[PDB]
Design a protein around this ligand. Structure first.
Ligand SMILES: Nc1nc2c(ncn2[C@@H]2O[C@H](COP(=O)(O)OP(=O)(O)OP(=O)(O)O)[C@@H](O)[C@H]2O)c(=O)[nH]1
Ligand SMILES: Nc1nc2c(ncn2[C@@H]2O[C@H](COP(=O)(O)OP(=O)(O)O)[C@@H](O)[C@H]2O)c(=O)[nH]1
Ligand SMILES: Nc1ncnc2c1ncn2[C@@H]1O[C@H](COP(=O)(O)OP(=O)(O)O)[C@@H](O)[C@H]1O
Ligand code: ALF
Ligand code: ALF
Ligand SMILES: [Mg+2]
Ligand SMILES: [Mg+2]
Ligand SMILES: [Mg+2]
Lengths: 159, 430, 431, 333
């Protein structure tokens, strides 16, 4: 949404808390997209900017907004290891089992990234342990493939 | 008749050679094409062709072509025959090992073949004058290789050096102390007499005496050329003193290893000095005993003399000289070793010093060059040895030499030889 | 020696490489058609170091352009100086490496490597006296990093006596979101420590920080970062490109800069720092250049030089200035800051003054430092690497390409030894 | 429990070249442990005079390493010296002449002779590898196709040459056939200093693995038996061309060996093992888990005084280095 949109995406990725608040008040589109289809929420979920994730969601950002690769902010906070953001998205209606263009789920991404605590929280919220990606891999298959013993033990019980 | 072959090695050697040969031509009235409208002693340094052209008895060698390319394209391109200007493709990269081994061994045979062709034109070859820097890979490594090979091919034939001692003001390599020690160790038993020229001493004289804010190699070489010409005038003109290469050794070298005389030149006056008239024989003689006019930075007052030669040129009378030496005796604390004839050796040439037309030096009615073997010169070795020690203790840069086929033992050996040399200067005149 | 063979690999390599060729062609008075239209004989004196003289009045970069992705090649050809390059020297794949070092090093890269060597051999065998190779690439991607290091090893095997020089761009989270960049950078550093003679550590962390903090560019682009890279590349190659005494070739530079074989990672620095096509004038003085060039704010590697000691330094001043003033200012800096220079390497700071300034500036200064503070850059990468490796994150992407987990362990071990070696010389005393 | 590196000095009789020139025997000897060169005494763990036999050298240098390897320890024996000081003579020797053979063929025999004596309920598994470091490349001496093997790290970050021919031997005869094969691939050239100058660093590795059928206990022992090439001045060797290129590389790995020792004797927090490939292979023998004996070779000629001094001072330095030696487990977490 115009000049305000580019500025909102920049402020969200830079972690400019106050500058995000100002642009919102000035009417910047909460869901203004970047060249990759990422909204200020995806950028804040990549960069680990919790306070910004919260202002954006309070100002009605789309929690399930998918970029051009089909990734939601949940897929991104799970990949980047941002536990506190993963808990915030889930508490605000994030699709636990959202699938990107590669058949990846936030669970595939947290397993591949090796973020034990994120996997524990995704499963709590209903992540499908049996979900297969376009490579025909489940979160458990990824865990054994990476040679992650801790994680494979964690996923074995359910799978 | 009494020929002397000059060998100019690497950049410093070649560039100093350019300055020396330019000055020799002016001194003997030889034009840049080898023609002279003016037998005579200059024949020791110049051969003559059937066409009446006078050709320097010299070889210019460098492992890279750029410096010699300037000689073969410059003023004086007709003075030298192309065969006496020898160049490779790749230099020694400031590495003694590349000069002595890797790169140098590729051109050594060709250089000896060219010196052999020059020696074949000599009826009474005295020996060689070798010009090189201590710091460069070619100047250090190639010179030591050449010196060893010349002792094999020429045996007992005299070899004198004009060595450029490194100064940080103008240094191009961090490894110069390594290259200096390695070349000194390797060349020591192959050289009869070596005149070190400290680039810092020359740099300071240019700044102080010639009012040159930032001296360049052009500035340094013009002044170096003046001292070289003074030392070689005894061979190129008809004198009584140091008329031959053997006389240099007899008069300046009391012990084989202690073969490093100190040169002091006076007067060094700026071309901008307008009202300030002509210096007396006493004034120029006094100037020889002052450290600021020295070719090497060191303190003779802290050392002992073992030989002294005063080479005057121009409007100088023997009565003026004797009067000056006598006053020096009553003045300065000028101490000679206990085992030595306490006396000077005096040379007088009636030709005033020649200056290059657009040069920094003023033309003087009378000049003097003092050649003295003093234990004070050991201070120059100590400075260099200390820099070597600092780096070597950490084996900093050593990998570069070892990679080229040198052994670490050669570094220890070279440094032990320098320590023995420092010990020799200490023992001499105890 | 004379000729340098230039290789450009991957997106970053080709973008920074292309900028290098346009900056140096302008300095040597060469237009986009290859014709010399300059007005100084100094511009052509050492033209043969980077250019081959082709039929007639034309000059052609001795450059090989490599990518596993075709798009970058098209962008280079379409560029200002795009037509200057030898058409047969563009060696491109169709697949890409997908930011995977293993695809670049063992898979897709290995399939393209021989086609590249065919072209490098042609350029090398045409040399009267080859100095060696200059590679531009990033360490964070797949091609530049994996294939670039594969090329380094292959070229070294065939040319063991030639100098291997790189302009290696270090990744930073500030400019790229790619998760696996620490893996790609650590796997590459392992290759560089063993296989290069000299590496210019061009850090995106530092480039971003200069653009944001000093140049006040709120959202820097690769165009902004590349403007600092091209100023640096011009500065560090001045000694190779114009007649001069100091570090005139790749080997003399290595001999002056590298006291220990593994410690060949340079921290470049530049002054004045400027933004793209912005005037300007006001020309910095010699004390200003001298101060600014030694400041943490002017370093192209995100390390504080005051946190370490300089083993060796090469300083290049460009423009018409007093050589006396340069000598005084340079001596002042090392007398006042004695503690930042190792006492056991005497006269370890070498200065050069080139009369030709770069375009847009009347006066400039380039610094090349071999500082123990570079360990800060390697520690930053190592910390990022271990955080991921400790949890075996993304490992199957690499092992799936035939790599072994042990290469990760070995690469990490090697980089930590490099850090440990820098620390040793940082603490060393002359005594 | 620890114990320093054992350094033992061996002087050879003056060679023909030496004798057929001036050359004075410069070494003087005090007791069974001191050599005196230029009134300076250089004392080692045991000094062997020129007259010393191959069986005498073996009995005092190795023989002890055989018990240790069998007990689960790691053993390293390497011969260091200047060109033609007797390195290959000490280590290889007349491989088949009973009185004339070196350390390696004697270890090979005494390995099996001790084993036949060992517990009947002890299962042994001996494998051997033989390779050279010629022109700074790890060339297999039992496979000519394997010309550039790589040094890699094990789980414990302990370097090892990955992919060398590992041959399971069962008899001393089986080992000798492979040493014969290995020797007959090892690069040799002619220097003015030595007619059969070794041009690579010979690494012979015995890998003994033992399991008790009742104790379910397993032991392992890596036995390194390195014949290094010698440090050489071009002046002395007359080394030109390919011979000199060989020399360039020998001096490089060798100065690196010295750097590793220097570092360890000085206790400098670093140690540049990552400098030569050789110095990474010996990494364990040098700082850690191996009982190491260095056999330093010297020429008693006055001609080779400088170099003999430098070999002695390496020895002196090396003798101070304390190893951190323990038994090898072969454990499963
Ligand atoms: N006086 C004087 N010193 C010079 C000159 N050129 C170089 N030097 C000095 O000599 C040393 C550098 O050695 P070079 O002669 O340039 O090198 P090289 O002999 O050509 O050897 P490589 O280039 O390494 O093959 C430094 O101490 C320089 O200051 C010159 O023309 N005059
Ligand atoms: N300075 C700079 N860095 C770049 C440029 N393009 C990409 N990068 C960086 O290079 C890395 C990505 O590698 P890239 O070159 O795209 O991969 P490749 O094409 O597979 O080699 C990241 O760290 C990017 O920040 C560029 O033009 N300039
Ligand atoms: N202790 C010794 N007694 C008698 N001859 C010896 C002794 N050591 C060496 N030699 C002889 O000296 C020569 C060179 O020895 P060698 O081991 O091959 O050299 P290197 O030390 O370079 O490995 C051989 O002919 C060898 O038999
Ligand atoms: F172009 Al890539 F990883 F091959 F960015
Ligand atoms: F056999 Al050698 F040096 F002569 F090891
Ligand atoms: Mg040169
Ligand atoms: Mg790309
Ligand atoms: Mg041998």
């Amino acid at each position: 949404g115009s000049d305000l949109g580019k500025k909102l995406l920049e402020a969200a990725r830079a972690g400019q808390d106050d500058e995000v608040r100002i642009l919102m008040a000035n009417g910047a589109d909460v869901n203004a997209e970047d060249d990759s289809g990422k909204t200020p929420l995806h950028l804040a979920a990549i960069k680990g900017h919790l306070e910004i994730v919260e202002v954006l969601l309070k100002h009605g950002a789309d929690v399930n907004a998918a970029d051009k690769m089909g990734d939601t902010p949940l897929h991104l906070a799970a990949l980047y290891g941002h536990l506190e953001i993963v808990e915030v998205l889930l508490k605000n209606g994030a699709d636990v089992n959202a699938t990107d263009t590669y058949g990846f789920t936030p669970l595939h991404l947290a397993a591949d990234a090796g973020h034990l605590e994120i996997v524990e929280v995704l499963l709590k919220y209903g992540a499908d342990v049996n979900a297969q990606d376009k490579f025909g891999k489940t979160a458990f298959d990824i865990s054994i493939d990476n040679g992650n013993e801790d994680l494979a033990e964690i996923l074995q019980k359910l799978n | 008749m009494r020929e002397c072959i000059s060998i100019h090695v690497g950049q410093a050697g070649v560039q100093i050679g350019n300055a020396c040969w330019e000055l020799y031509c002016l001194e003997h009235g030889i034009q840049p094409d080898g023609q002279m409208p003016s037998d005579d002693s200059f024949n020791t340094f110049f051969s003559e062709t059937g066409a009446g052209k006078h050709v320097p008895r010299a070889v210019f060698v460098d492992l890279e072509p750029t410096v010699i390319d300037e000689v073969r394209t410059g003023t004086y391109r007709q003075l030298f025959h192309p065969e006496q200007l020898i160049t490779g493709k790749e230099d020694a990269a400031n590495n003694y090992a590349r000069g002595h081994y890797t790169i140098g061994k590729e051109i050594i045979d060709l250089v000896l073949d060219r010196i052999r062709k020059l020696a074949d034109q000599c009826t009474g070859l005295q020996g060689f004058l070798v010009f090189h820097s201590f710091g460069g890979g070619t100047g250090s490594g190639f010179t030591s290789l050449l010196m060893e090979r010349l002792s094999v091919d020429y045996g007992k034939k005299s070899k004198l050096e004009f060595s450029i001692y490194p100064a940080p003001q103008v240094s191009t390599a961090v490894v110069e102390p390594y290259n200096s020690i390695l070349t000194t160790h390797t060349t020591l038993e192959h050289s009869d007499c070596a005149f070190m020229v400290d680039n810092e001493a020359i740099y300071d004289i240019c700044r102080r005496n010639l009012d040159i804010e930032r001296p360049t190699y052009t500035n340094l070489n013009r002044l170096i050329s003046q001292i070289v010409s003074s030392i070689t005038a005894s061979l190129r003109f008809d004198g009584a003193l140091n008329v031959d290469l053997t006389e240099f050794q007899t008069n300046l070298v009391p012990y084989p290893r202690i073969h490093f005389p100190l040169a002091t030149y006076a007067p060094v006056i700026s071309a901008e000095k307008a009202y300030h008239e002509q210096l007396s024989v006493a004034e120029i003689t006094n100037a020889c005993f002052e450290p600021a006019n020295q070719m090497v930075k060191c303190d003779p007052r802290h050392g002992k003399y073992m030989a002294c030669c005063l080479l005057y040129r121009g409007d100088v009378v023997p009565k003026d000289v004797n009067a000056a030496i006598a006053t020096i005796k009553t003045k300065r604390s000028i101490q000679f070793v206990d085992w030595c004839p306490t006396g000077f050796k005096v040379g007088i040439n009636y030709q005033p010093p020649t200056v290059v037309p657009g040069g920094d030096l003023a033309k003087v009615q009378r000049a003097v060059c003092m050649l003295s073997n003093t234990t004070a010169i050991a201070e120059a070795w100590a400075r260099l040895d200390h820099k070597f020690d600092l780096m070597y203790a950490k084996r900093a840069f050593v990998h570069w030499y070892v990679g080229e086929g040198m052994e670490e033992g050669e570094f220890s050996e070279a440094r032990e030889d320098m320590a023995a040399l420092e010990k020799d200067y200490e023992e001499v005149g105890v | 020696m004379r000729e340098i063979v230039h290789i450009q690999a991957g997106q970053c390599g080709n973008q920074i490489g292309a900028k290098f060729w346009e900056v140096i062609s302008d300095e040597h008075g060469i237009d986009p058609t290859g014709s010399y239209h300059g007005d100084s004989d100094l511009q052509l004196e050492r033209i043969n170091v980077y250019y081959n003289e082709a039929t007639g009045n034309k000059y052609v970069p001795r450059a090989i352009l490599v990518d596993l992705e075709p798009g970058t090649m098209d962008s280079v050809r379409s560029g200002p100086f795009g037509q200057i390059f030898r058409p047969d020297n563009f060696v491109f794949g169709q697949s890409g490496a997908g930011n995977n070092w293993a695809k670049g090093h063992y898979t897709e890269g290995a399939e393209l490597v021989d086609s590249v060597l065919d072209v490098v051999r042609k350029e090398s065998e045409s040399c009267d006296c080859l100095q060696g190779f200059q590679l531009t690439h990033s360490l964070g991607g797949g091609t530049g990093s994996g294939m670039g290091t594969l090329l380094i090893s292959k070229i070294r095997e065939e040319y063991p006596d030639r100098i291997m020089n790189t302009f290696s761009v270090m990744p930073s989270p500030k400019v790229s979101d790619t998760v696996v960049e620490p893996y790609n950078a650590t796997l590459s550093v392992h290759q560089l420590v063993e296989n290069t003679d000299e590496t210019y550590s061009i850090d995106n962390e530092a480039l971003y920080d200069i653009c944001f903090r000093t140049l006040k560019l709120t959202t820097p682009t690769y165009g902004d970062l590349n403007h600092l890279v091209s100023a640096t590349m011009s500065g560090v190659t001045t000694c190779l490109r114009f007649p001069g005494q100091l570090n005139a070739d790749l080997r003399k530079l290595a001999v002056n800069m590298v006291p220990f074989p593994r410690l060949h990672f340079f921290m470049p620095g530049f002054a004045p720092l400027t933004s793209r096509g912005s005037q300007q004038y006001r020309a910095l003085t010699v004390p200003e250049l001298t101060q600014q060039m030694f400041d943490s704010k002017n370093m192209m590697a995100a390390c504080d030089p005051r946190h370490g000691r300089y083993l060796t330094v090469a300083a290049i001043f460009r423009g018409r200035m007093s050589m006396k003033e340069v000598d005084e200012q340079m001596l002042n800096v090392q007398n006042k800051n004695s503690s930042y220079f190792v006492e056991w390497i005497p006269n370890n700071v070498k200065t050069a003054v080139c009369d030709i300034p770069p375009r847009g500036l009347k006066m400039s200064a380039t610094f090349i430092g071999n500082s123990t503070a570079i360990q800060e850059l390697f520690k930053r990468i190592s910390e990022q690497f271990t955080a991921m490796f400790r949890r075996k994150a993304f490992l199957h992407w690499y092992t799936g390409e035939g790599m072994d987990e042990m290469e990760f362990t070995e690469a990490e071990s090697n980089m930590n030894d490099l850090v440990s070696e820098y620390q040793q010389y940082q603490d060393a005393t002359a005594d | 429990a620890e114990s320093n590196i054992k350094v033992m000095c061996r002087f050879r009789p003056l060679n023909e070249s030496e004798v057929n020139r001036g050359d004075k025997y410069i070494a003087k000897f005090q007791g069974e442990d001191t050599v005196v060169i230029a009134s300076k005494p250089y004392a080692f763990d045991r000094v062997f005079q020129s007259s010393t036999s191959q069986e005498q050298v073996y009995n005092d240098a190795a023989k002890k390493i055989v018990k240790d390897v069998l007990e689960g320890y790691n053993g390293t024996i390497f011969a260091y010296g200047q060109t033609s000081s007797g390195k290959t003579h000490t280590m290889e020797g007349k491989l088949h002449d009973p009185e004339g053979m070196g350390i390696i063929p004697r270890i090979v025999q005494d390995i099996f002779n001790y084993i036949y004596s060992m517990d009947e309920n002890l299962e042994f598994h001996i494998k051997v590898s033989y390779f050279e470091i010629y022109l700074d490349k790890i060339r297999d001496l039992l496979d000519v196709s394997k010309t550039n093997l790589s040094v890699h790290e094990d789980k414990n970050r302990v370097p090892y040459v990955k992919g060398a021919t590992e041959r399971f031997v069962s008899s001393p005869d089986e080992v000798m056939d492979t040493i014969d094969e290995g020797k007959s691939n090892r690069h040799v050239a002619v220097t003015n200093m030595n007619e059969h100058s070794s041009r690579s660093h010979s690494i012979f590795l015995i890998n003994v693995k033992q399991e008790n059928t009742q104790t379910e206990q397993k032991l392992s022992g890596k036995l390194y038996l390195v014949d290094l090439a010698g440090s050489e001045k071009v002046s002395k060797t007359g080394a030109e061309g390919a011979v000199l290129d060989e020399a360039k590389n020998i001096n490089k790995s060798l100065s690196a060996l010295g750097n590793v020792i220097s570092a360890l004797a000085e206790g400098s927090t670093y140690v540049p093992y990552r400098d030569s490939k050789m110095t990474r292979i010996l990494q364990d023998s040098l700082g850690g888990n191996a009982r190491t004996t260095i056999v330093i070779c010297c020429s008693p000629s006055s001609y080779n005084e400088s170099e003999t001094k430098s070999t002695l001072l390496f020895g002196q330095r090396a003798k101070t280095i304390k190893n951190t030696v323990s038994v090898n487990v072969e454990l499963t977490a």
